[PDB]
Amino acid sequence: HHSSGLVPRGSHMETVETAIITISMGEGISEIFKSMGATHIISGGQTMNPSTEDIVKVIEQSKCKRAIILPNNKNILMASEQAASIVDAEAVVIPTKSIPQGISALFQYDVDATLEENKAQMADSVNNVKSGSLTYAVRDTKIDGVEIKKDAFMGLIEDKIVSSQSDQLTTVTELLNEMLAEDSEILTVIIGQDAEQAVTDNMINWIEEQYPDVEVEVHEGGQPIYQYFFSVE
Amino acid sequence: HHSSGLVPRGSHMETVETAIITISMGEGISEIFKSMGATHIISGGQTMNPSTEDIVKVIEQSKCKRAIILPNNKNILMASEQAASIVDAEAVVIPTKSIPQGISALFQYDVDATLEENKAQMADSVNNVKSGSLTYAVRDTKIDGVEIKKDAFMGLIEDKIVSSQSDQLTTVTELLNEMLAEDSEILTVIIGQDAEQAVTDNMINWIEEQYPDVEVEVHEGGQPIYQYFFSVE
């Protein structure tokens, strides 16, 4: 859903030496991505995905010498790779396949690090960090062939539905029961606008009991739609 | 729950050259295990787990020359290893940690194979096959700290709760959504006494859509309590 007239392509065009280009799915993630180091946000989930030439134009207009591209959607990986090949800039693609995966990869971005150091750390995150999210059904919906009734909570791992229940705590603890293992070391939790403090507190207490060795790192995100983003190292 | 008087220790004492010793959790699995090659079933989930000497006695009374022990419970692994060390027989432990894992390991047992060939294949199954089950809450219950209301269906992977819902199809398809991956090759389904044919048919149709490359191998089990056992190779 967008407003009538010309739909913005993405964020304000800044001039930068190293462009950190992230695709949003049009659900209110831009603040978070900019906070984490993104320089250019491209709006995704329009009818047409961002094209090869859409990404080339962001890279060229930014006047960057180097770029890191996070498609955050498996459908946008080809356009990103094609763009990276075309441009004069030294451009690399971190092959993130979801918004939570993009968040996890941006934890590893360091503005002081070299392009190659950032590439290696962010690419490792896609392979070795488990990303997921908690949301809810604003209307009856189908994910992965599973029918979810309006108002149900939904636990997702890498955007696949794994749990759903009318009860939020039950949904999120089942989600985390699969995301966490006895050898997990760090769980990052990013709290959305609609999260309930009593759920968050009960969830943390559950983690501490069931997975007593995991470090729980909580941050405020303020995102709509997703009560939590989770990342397990 | 057992009947008054002396509670049976396990199945009929047979004399065999190679004993295949499996622990039941006292929920109606003996038929299935015997079908699959078990020679001796020890009853588990009494107050006290089977002891080292309980297992030694089964091995000694069977007059076996060789034995394979499947504890099917992490609490019984030490007794099994201690027994295997004590007996004259050449005894090996396959370190199964649940009943579904024991089932998966028994798929690999071949009465014509050597002890070492069976050991290797069955041990590989514990490491490389994903086992799980679908059940339901006969009363309000807590698994892994998660409260489940009476009548809810429950999806388990390696005995950890991952999904639960009043709707059976939703629960089992969410379970399978996590058990199956794009590169899964074979799903074995063992149908319990209480399974519903309409659920089974809808579940199979869902698998075929979402995971079109997986081979689905269905067998009748007839077990109580677990509508399905699942094994993913």
Residue numbers in the entry:
A (entry chain A), B (entry chain A): 316 to 548
Authors' own words:
Fatty acid kinase (Fak) is a two-component enzyme that generates acyl-phosphate for phospholipid synthesis. Fak consists of a kinase domain protein (FakA) that phosphorylates a fatty acid enveloped by a fatty acid binding protein (FakB). We find FakA consists of three independently folded domains. The N-terminal domain (FakA_N) is the ATP binding component, the central domain (FakA_L) encodes the dimerization function along with a Cys-His-His catalytic triad, and the C-terminal domain (FakA_C) functions to bind the FakB substrate.
